[PDB]
Each structure stands twice: as C-alpha cells, then as structure tokens.
Amino acid sequence: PAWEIPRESIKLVKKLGAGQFGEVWMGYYNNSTKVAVKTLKPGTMSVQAFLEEANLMKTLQHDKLVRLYAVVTKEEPIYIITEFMAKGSLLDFLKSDEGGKVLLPKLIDFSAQIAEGMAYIERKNYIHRDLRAANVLVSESLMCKIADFGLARVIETAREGAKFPIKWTAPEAINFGCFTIKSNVWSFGILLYEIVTYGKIPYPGRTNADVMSALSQGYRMPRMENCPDELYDIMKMCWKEKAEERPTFDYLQSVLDDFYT
Numbered sequence: 673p674a675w676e677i678p679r680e681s682i683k684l685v686k687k688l689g690a691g692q693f694g695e696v697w698m699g700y701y702n703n704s705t706k707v708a709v710k711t712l713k714p715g716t717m718s719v720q721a722f723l724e725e726a727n728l729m730k731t732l733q734h735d736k737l738v739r740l741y742a743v744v745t746k747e748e749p750i751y752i753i754t755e756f757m758a759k760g761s762l763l764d765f766l767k768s769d770e771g772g773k774v775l776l777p778k779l780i781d782f783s784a785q786i787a788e789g790m791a792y793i794e795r796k797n798y799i800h801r802d803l804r805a806a807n808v809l810v811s812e813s814l815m816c817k818i819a820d821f822g823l824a825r826v827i828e829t830a831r832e833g834a835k836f837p838i839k840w841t842a843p844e845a846i847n848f849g850c851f852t853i854k855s856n857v858w859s860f861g862i863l864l865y866e867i868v869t870y871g872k873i874p875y876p877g878r879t880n881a882d883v884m885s886a887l888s889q890g891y892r893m894p895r896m897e898n899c900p901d902e903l904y905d906i907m908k909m910c911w912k913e914k915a916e917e918r919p920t921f922d923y924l925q926s927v928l929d930d931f932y933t
C-alpha cells in the first residue's frame with residue numbers, strides 16, 4: 673500500500689536483538705524520526721508470514737500499542753518499521769537496577785496501561801494470544817505498549833515458527849484449543865504476577881508439563897510476597913477456571929486505574 677517506503681530512507685544503527693528468524697535494530701526514517709526495524713532473515717520464515725504481523729498492525733492502531741510506521745518489501749531483505757520504545761521490553765526493564773527501583777504505585781500504573789491496550793483489542797474484536805512482560809515495551813517517558821502481534825487474530829490458525837507461551841496460556845486454550853479474549857485475561861493475570869515480582873518466571877522451578885498437570889488439578893500460584901490482597905484478588909479474577917466468569921479488560925483498566933498505588 674501506502675505503507676511501503678524506499679530502503680534508502682532507512683539507516684540501521686544499533687543491533688538490539690537477534691532471533692532465529694531475524695534481527696531487531698534501532699534506526700532512523702529520513703534522519704528525523706527515531707524508529708525500530710525488524711529484519712527478516714531470508715528463507716527461515718516465509719515473507720508472507722513475516723509480514724502477516726505488519727498487515728495486522730495496519731488495522732490495529734491505538735496509543736497503548738506499538739505503532740507501525742512502514743514496511744520495506746520490494747527486495748530481498750524485508751523490513752518492518754515501527755514506533756521506537758527506548759527502555760526495551762517490560763520484562764528486561766523490571767529486572768534492571770532501574771526497574772528494581774520502580775515502586776508499587778508505578779507498577780500498578782504499568783499494568784493499567786496494558787489493560788487499556790487490551791481494552792482496545794477487546795473492543796476491536798481481536799485476540800493477542802501472546803500477552804506477557806517480554807512482549808510489552810517501555811518508552812523513555814515510561815509508557816507501556818503492547819508489542820509482538822505474531823500470534824494475534826481477529827475472532828471468527830498460527831503463523832510459521834510460532835509457539836504459544838505455555839505458562840501464560842489459559843487451560844481451556846491449551847486443552848480445548850479455545851482462544852478468546854477471556855484466555856487473554858488469564859494471560860493478563862500471569863502478566864500481573866510478572867510485574868509485582870519484578871520479572872520472575874511463572875511457577876518457579878516447575879516444568880510446562882507440571883504446570884499443565886497442576887492447573888487441571890486446580891492449582892493457582894499462592895499470594896506472592898509483597899503483593900497486597902487487593903491486587904491478588906485481581907489476579908485471582910483473571911485465573912477463574914470458568915472462562916465466562918473472568919472480568920472484562922474494561923473492568924481491569926478501571927479497577928487498576930482506581931487502586932491508588
């Protein structure tokens with residue numbers, strides 16, 4: 673479309689990450705605008721499936737979601753160009769010495785910002801399916817934005833090399849293949865655990881299979897050290913066995929915007 677831009681109007685400067693399917697760079701569109709560039713490593717992924725993410729981002733545009741700016745899809749090395757988030761992923765940020773100094777009022781603010789982005793996705797009739805701290809990005813001004821739309825779908829299917837985050841996925845989605853906005857709410861509850869514990873892995877020392885088995889037996893993570901009851905009740909609401917009895921993202925954004933600290 674008019675999402676295509678000439679290659680020359682993009683200068684790649686600093687390599688930020690390397691995956692099996694390519695690379696992530698910080699760069700510049702036309703000298704002016706600071707951007708992030710995702711590079712497709714040829715042949716590993718299809719070019720079709722690599723761009724599936726961008727095509728979805730074309731239609732998914734909100735303040736609390738990382739914005740697409742453009743693509744380069746005319747010759748071999750395929751680029752996806754987006755809004756740049758200075759602080760990197762929320763997970764990595766929480767584990768850093770800086771994030772480890774970020775107190776509970778601001779942590780609850782983080783989660784509310786994410787609940788807002790998810791309220792949009794809900795309202796837009798989409799699902800994310802890959803909602804975790806690793807897939808949220810932090811700006812200089814400490815704004816949290818939902819990233820990584822590889823597994824995202826419109827309601828009523830998986831991209832190449834995909835892989836669901838077992839420990840973040842609702843049991844009904846694992847066992848019955850039932851991905852809905854309500855399975856994202858489960859994920860959000862796990863994301864809340866990640867925020868309050870400063871980027872700790874879900875179910876410490878437990879294997880994915882132990883997790884799957886334990887959940888079918890009615891296990892939920894016990895209240896975490898230094899996490900107020902009111903916050904744990906919100907997590908608990910997200911992990912309700914019966915999907916239909918889990919809250920809306922509109923409710924979560926409201927209640928978290930409403931928790932004073």
Ligand SMILES: Cc1nc(Nc2ncc(C(=O)Nc3c(C)cccc3Cl)s2)cc(N2CCN(CCO)CC2)n1
Nearest residue numbers: 688689708709710738752754756757758759760819820
């Ligand atoms: C992995 C990473 N990304 C950063 N910024 C990004 N902004 C937006 C990103 C993104 O991927 N967008 C995107 C694209 C491009 C395509 C499809 C979909 C999407 Cl959502 S990646 C910063 C960062 N840093 C390294 C560690 N730091 C501490 C030590 O200095 C700070 C900075 N590392």
